[PDB]
Design an enzyme around this catalytic site. Structure first.
Site, PDB file in Angstrom:
ATOM      1  N   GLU A 208       8.625   3.044  -5.827  1.00  0.00           N
ATOM      2  CA  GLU A 208       8.066   4.232  -6.472  1.00  0.00           C
ATOM      3  C   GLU A 208       9.091   5.354  -6.509  1.00  0.00           C
ATOM      4  OE1 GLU A 208       4.421   5.242  -4.478  1.00  0.00           O
ATOM      5  OE2 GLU A 208       3.870   3.131  -4.165  1.00  0.00           O
TER       6      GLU A 208
ATOM      7  N   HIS B 167      10.412   8.141  -2.335  1.00  0.00           N
ATOM      8  CA  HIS B 167      10.122   9.417  -2.984  1.00  0.00           C
ATOM      9  C   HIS B 167      11.082  10.323  -2.213  1.00  0.00           C
ATOM     10  CE1 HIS B 167       6.607   8.150  -5.223  1.00  0.00           C
ATOM     11  NE2 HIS B 167       6.090   7.609  -4.135  1.00  0.00           N
TER      12      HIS B 167
ATOM     13  N   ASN C 278       4.012  -2.126   1.511  1.00  0.00           N
ATOM     14  CA  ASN C 278       4.679  -0.992   0.887  1.00  0.00           C
ATOM     15  C   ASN C 278       4.502   0.289   1.719  1.00  0.00           C
ATOM     16  OD1 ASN C 278       6.008  -0.003  -1.656  1.00  0.00           O
ATOM     17  ND2 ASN C 278       4.094   1.143  -1.913  1.00  0.00           N
TER      18      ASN C 278
ATOM     19  N   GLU D 114       1.051   1.940   2.840  1.00  0.00           N
ATOM     20  CA  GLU D 114       1.123   3.030   3.815  1.00  0.00           C
ATOM     21  C   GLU D 114       0.336   2.809   5.113  1.00  0.00           C
ATOM     22  OE1 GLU D 114      -0.053   6.412   1.416  1.00  0.00           O
ATOM     23  OE2 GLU D 114       1.682   6.150   0.097  1.00  0.00           O
TER      24      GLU D 114
ATOM     25  N   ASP E 191      11.536   8.338  -7.303  1.00  0.00           N
ATOM     26  CA  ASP E 191      11.604   9.633  -7.965  1.00  0.00           C
ATOM     27  C   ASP E 191      12.375  10.497  -6.966  1.00  0.00           C
ATOM     28  OD1 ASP E 191       9.573  10.466  -6.100  1.00  0.00           O
ATOM     29  OD2 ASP E 191       8.000  10.328  -7.607  1.00  0.00           O
TER      30      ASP E 191
END
Length: 302
Positions: free
Chosen positions: A237, A209, A172, A131, A239
């Site tokens: 990641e 996400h 990432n 990030e 979801d």
């Protein structure tokens, strides 16, 4: 565990893995271990390899949790993605209070080198920098950027490459789910610039996400992220609020469509353990049974 393994099926389609985030506290409770053994082929430590957990006090490392996961993974034949080396969150206050460039540079290099060398040859990929971007495409003004300057990124990757040449080095980030998004365009441009300059960046990780309905955008965003030229890209990641099969299948298809997409990691096993449990965004429900989306992915991979 579900009878059919999405990891085996995605491997049959030419990909490397379909994994999940986990750690000792999950592996030792409920049916997490079984589900991961039978249905996935890769794990990412949810928290055990983060800075606050591994170096709570300068030079006083704690690998208990990280070792459990790595050993469990090796024994059970699961690939491992190291997560994460340089990040502004879950960062001990002793790090954030350093205002000297030299001091911080050495602290960063020591943290990277120590973690990577301990697991040398056992980690497939590492999220070296996490990030690092603001939503407008500019670099996030974290302690590393403020004290070290823009060079912190090249330094982190050069250091990681030297520590374990065998590991795939990733940058990432999240919100790289739309092709028109400022952040998506910015990371593609910066990674190209960095790679042209010789910075060893092997992959771009897109956290992914998502909110309900966003899956469609990933079909355009992923090919864009792949255009940066890195050897690999990956959904790191995943979801989705609501866990609609439509969104989940879209993300999977995006990866199958991009040659360089090596795999997918879902952020957790069962809904109640999600960092956003209230949106029931995962593939297994509170009773550890696979959800419609899991089945939709299996059928799509068939």
């Amino acid at each position: 565990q579900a009878a059919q393994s999405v990891d085996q099926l995605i491997k049959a389609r030419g990909k490397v893995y379909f994994g999940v985030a986990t750690d000792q506290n999950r592996l030792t409770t409920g049916k997490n271990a079984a589900i991961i053994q039978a249905d996935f082929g890769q794990v990412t430590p949810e928290n055990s390899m983060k800075w606050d957990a591994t170096e709570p006090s300068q030079g006083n490392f704690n690998f208990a949790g990280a070792d459990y996961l790595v050993n469990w993974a090796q024994q059970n034949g699961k690939l491992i993605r190291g997560h994460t080396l340089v990040w502004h969150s879950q960062l001990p206050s002793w790090v954030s209070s350093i205002t000297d460039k030299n001091t911080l540079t050495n602290v960063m290099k020591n943290h990277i080198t120590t973690l990577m060398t301990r697991y040398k040859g056992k980690i497939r990929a590492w999220d070296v920098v996490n990030e690092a971007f603001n939503e407008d495409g500019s670099l996030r003004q974290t302690v590393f950027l403020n004290v070290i300057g823009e060079d912190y990124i090249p330094i982190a990757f050069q250091t990681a490459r030297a520590a374990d040449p065998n590991a795939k080095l990733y940058i990432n980030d999240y919100n790289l789910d739309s092709a028109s998004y400022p952040k998506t365009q910015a990371i593609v441009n910066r990674v190209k610039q960095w790679r042209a300059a010789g910075v060893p960046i092997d992959g771009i990780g897109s956290q992914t996400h998502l909110s309900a309905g966003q899956g469609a955008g990933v079909l355009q965003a992923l090919p864009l992220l792949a255009s940066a030229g890195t050897p690999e890209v990956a959904i790191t990641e995943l979801d989705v609020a609501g866990a609609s099969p439509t969104d989940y299948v879209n993300v999977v298809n995006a990866c199958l469509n991009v040659q360089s997409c090596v795999g997918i990691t879902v952020w957790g096993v069962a809904d109640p353990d999600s960092w956003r449990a209230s949106t029931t965004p995962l593939l297994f429900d509170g009773n550890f049974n696979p959800k419609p989306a899991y089945n939709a992915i299996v059928q799509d991979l068939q």
